[PDB]
Amino acid sequence: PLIVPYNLPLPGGVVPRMLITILGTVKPNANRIALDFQRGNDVAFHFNPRFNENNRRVIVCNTKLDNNWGREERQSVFPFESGKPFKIQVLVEPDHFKVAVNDAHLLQYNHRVKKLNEISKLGISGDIDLTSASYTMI
Numbered sequence: 001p002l003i004v005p006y007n008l009p010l011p012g013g014v015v016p017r018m019l020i021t022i023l024g025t026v027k028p029n030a031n032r033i034a035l036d037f038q039r040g041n042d043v044a045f046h047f048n049p050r051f052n053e054n055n056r057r058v059i060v061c062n063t064k065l066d067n068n069w070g071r072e073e074r075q076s077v078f079p080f081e082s083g084k085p086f087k088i089q090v091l092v093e094p095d096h097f098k099v100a101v102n103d104a105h106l107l108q109y110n111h112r113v114k115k116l117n118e119i120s121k122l123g124i125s126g127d128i129d130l131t132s133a134s135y136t137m138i
């Protein structure tokens with residue numbers, strides 16, 4: 001097992017056909033999970049399941065530039081469950097990050113940060129036990 005928050009370096013940045021796979025289990029009474037693809041201090045893609053935002057479960061995605069959050073993209077389809085094991089796969093495509101959870105397509109996030117090769121770290125945080133975090137080229 002891995003210590004959370006965990007930093008996964010992405011050597012040379014991301015590129016299309018790179019597949020990141022994260023395996024873990026949601027804690028009991030979880031509040032939030034976050035994946036943060038970073039370009040230095042900037043967050044190119046923040047993927048943030050929220051377990052109780054005004055008694056709703058929602059995934060919020062966004063980008064942070066110069067310490068400012070941008071326009072949120074919100075998904076009400078919510079495949080995570082407190083206490084249960086999950087798999088998140090993020091496939092870098094030419095125009096977007098493509099996210100699947102437990103083998104089912106979830107969402108796509110169009111590239112706002114376009115210098116893909118400068119997105120050099122992935123932070124994994126929140127209310128999880130982290131089992132593995134890896135990448136491969138498909």
Ligand SMILES: COc1cccc(CO[C@H]2[C@@H](O)[C@@H](CO)O[C@@H](O[C@H]3[C@H](O)[C@@H](NC(C)=O)[C@H](NC(C)=O)O[C@@H]3CO)[C@@H]2O)c1
Nearest residue numbers: 032034046047048053060061062063069070071072073125
């Ligand atoms: C909770 O713990 C941590 C730890 C590290 C980093 C964060 C960053 O969390 C922020 C991030 O998820 C951004 C993504 O857009 O949202 C921030 O929250 C927003 C919130 O989503 C907005 N809610 C709505 C309903 O629009 C709110 N909007 C208004 C008008 O207030 O704005 C906040 C602040 O940007 C979240 O803090 C978290």
